[PDB]
């Protein structure tokens, strides 16, 4: 009861900062998005294709077994 009153009362003061709309314009002015994670993909359709990064490839172990 006291906590949910004091948190909202502090939010009223902290949210009421000056200007408050130029930063909306600053954030929305960069309509190019944040840069997204790179994957190897095909040129025509963009399905992922397998990678040979050393820090992942150094953990891999395979073996050979006879067939039936």
């Amino acid at each position: 009861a006291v906590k949910v009153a004091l948190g909202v009362a502090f939010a009223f003061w902290w949210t009421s900062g000056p200007g408050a709309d130029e930063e909306m314009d600053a954030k929305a002015q960069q309509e190019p998005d944040r840069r997204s994670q790179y994957t190897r993909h095909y040129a025509f359709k963009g399905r992922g294709r397998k990678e040979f990064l050393r820090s992942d490839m150094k953990n891999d172990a395979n073996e050979l077994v006879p067939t039936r």
Partner: peptide, 26 residues
């Protein structure tokens, strides 16, 4: 053809490591 930034990103992606021999354990 695709843009040349596609080829530049594809040819520079970190330190690689190739495929090796797998052994028959028995």
């Amino acid at each position: 053809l695709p843009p040349m930034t596609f080829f530049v990103e594809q040819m520079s992606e970190g330190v690689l490591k190739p495929e090796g021999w797998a052994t028959m354990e028995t």
